[PDB]
Design a protein around this ligand. Structure first.
Ligand SMILES: Nc1ncnc2c1ncn2[C@@H]1O[C@H](COP(=O)(O)O)[C@@H](O)[C@H]1O
Length: 419
């Protein structure tokens, strides 16, 4: 059972992760056959964090690349494809400076070309790419693309697919199979996978990733309140205004200001609600900010910072989140904690602790006000970060596409038996 390997570097907004995948050579076009072999988390910031020192972007990757040499058998290095895909961190940098962006891409390319893997390029994914490849990963891993049944008795309707919601640091994506008519070509996706047609909706909200939303709320709190209602009472920090307003996400919104929390769940809710413009919709139905969206439908997996935040609510706060009402209640309780009370629940390192209130509030509003989940549809949402021992994200679907491992049709069209 000879194995083949593939490597993807997920160059995310706040961090880079390396995934190494493996699959049997002779079974490689089977759905669900590829799985994660290993992974490595790059120390420090995302590659976009090196905009003013691009050489360091390439160097950042070396420790994980050295791991990949150990993870993949030597005799297989040369025929193992290596991809780097960058997402909203690089999309934002590209708005600020196409030149700095190109220099960062040049620096990672120079590093990656020094290694013995079959390097296939460093690219910035589109928002659509990011949404769709995440949806592909989840559904591939869970074997939803199998045609269930047997001759003369196929399951009808076709096996449902799992919608995907991904909360990264700089954008958030929602992607799902839909029967609704397409109203905006930018949201419309058609896939031909194992002989089947999937009509998919996708959208990426740039500036609605976790870190960018936290920056926007901080900017807003500074303007409206001169205290931060989402931060816990007794928490304060020295805010460098240059960092607050340097992002494309906050430009629209005295080197240093002190800012303190107040644990005001209601004012926090009000602050978060200003992130969603529902005033206008040029389509039959919108999510928010005038973006076309059909009604959510089917199961969904919510991963990345959706998962991390919900995991904090359930495991650290010890609160149920099974319903939208429970998620709302858990957010209110979290937001109403003082800084001492919150710290008492977290014996170890406290990074991100002051931010859970704001992120939880955001997620609740995004799902309920933004995407228009209600109790019935929300019941179909699961929070998970892994399937079949493989991290859920866009990297796997990306590798599958570029290595051409998912066929449009089954071999010989399976004699036409699925017609
Ligand atoms: N354990 C965690 N709890 C809450 N947020 C997290 C955790 N680990 C990572 N994150 C955040 O998830 C986001 C990942 O963004 P990205 O780098 O674009 O994938 C960043 O905002 C991270 O800070």
């Amino acid at each position: 059972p000879a194995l083949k390997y593939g490597i993807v570097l997920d160059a995310g907004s706040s961090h880079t992760s390396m995934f190494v995948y493996k699959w049997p050579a002779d079974k490689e076009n089977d759905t669900g056959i590829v799985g994660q072999h290993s992974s490595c988390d790059v120390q420090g910031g995302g590659i976009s964090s090196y905009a003013n020192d691009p050489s360091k972007a390439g160097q950042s990757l070396v420790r994980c690349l050295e791991q990949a040499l150990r993870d993949v058998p030597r005799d297989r290095h040369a025929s193992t494809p290596l991809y780097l895909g960058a997402t909203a961190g690089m999309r934002l940098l590209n708005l600020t400076s196409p030149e700095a962006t190109a220099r960062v891409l040049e620096a990672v390319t120079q590093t990656l070309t020094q290694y013995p893997f079959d390097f296939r390029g460093a690219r910035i994914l589109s928002g659509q790419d990011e949404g769709v490849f995440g949806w592909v990963t989840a559904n591939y891993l869970l074997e939803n693309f199998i045609k269930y049944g047997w001759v003369g008795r196929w399951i009808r309707p076709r096996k449902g697919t799992l919608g995907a919601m991904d909360l990264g640091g700089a954008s958030t994506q929602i992607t799902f199979e839909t029967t609704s008519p397409s109203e905006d070509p930018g949201n419309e996706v058609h896939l031909r996978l194992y002989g089947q047609h999937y009509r998919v909706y996708t959208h990426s909200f740039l500036c609605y990733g976790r870190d960018q939303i936290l920056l926007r709320l901080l900017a807003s709190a500074l303007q409206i309140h001169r205290f931060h209602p989402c931060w816990p009472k007794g928490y304060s920090t020295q805010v460098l205004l240059q960092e607050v307003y340097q992002s494309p996400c906050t430009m629209g919104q005295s080197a240093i200001v002190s800012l303190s929390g107040t644990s005001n769940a209601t004012l926090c809710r009000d602050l978060v609600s200003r992130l969603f413009n529902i005033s206008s919709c040029p389509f039959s139905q919108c999510s928010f900010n005038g973006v076309f969206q059909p009604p959510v439908a089917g199961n969904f997996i919510a991963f990345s910072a959706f998962y991390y935040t919900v995991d904090f609510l359930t495991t650290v706060m010890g609160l149920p989140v099974g319903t939208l009402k429970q998620l709302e209640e858990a957010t209110e309780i979290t937001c109403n904690q003082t800084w001492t009370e919150l710290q008492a629940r977290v014996p170890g390192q406290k990074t991100r602790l002051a931010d859970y209130c704001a992120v939880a509030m955001f997620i609740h509003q995004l799902l309920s006000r933004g995407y228009h989940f209600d109790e019935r549809s929300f019941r179909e949402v699961v929070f998970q970060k892994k399937a079949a021992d493989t991290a859920v994200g866009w990297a796997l679907g990306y590798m599958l596409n570029l290595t051409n491992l998912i066929p449009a049709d089954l071999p010989g069209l399976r004699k036409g038996t699925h017609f």
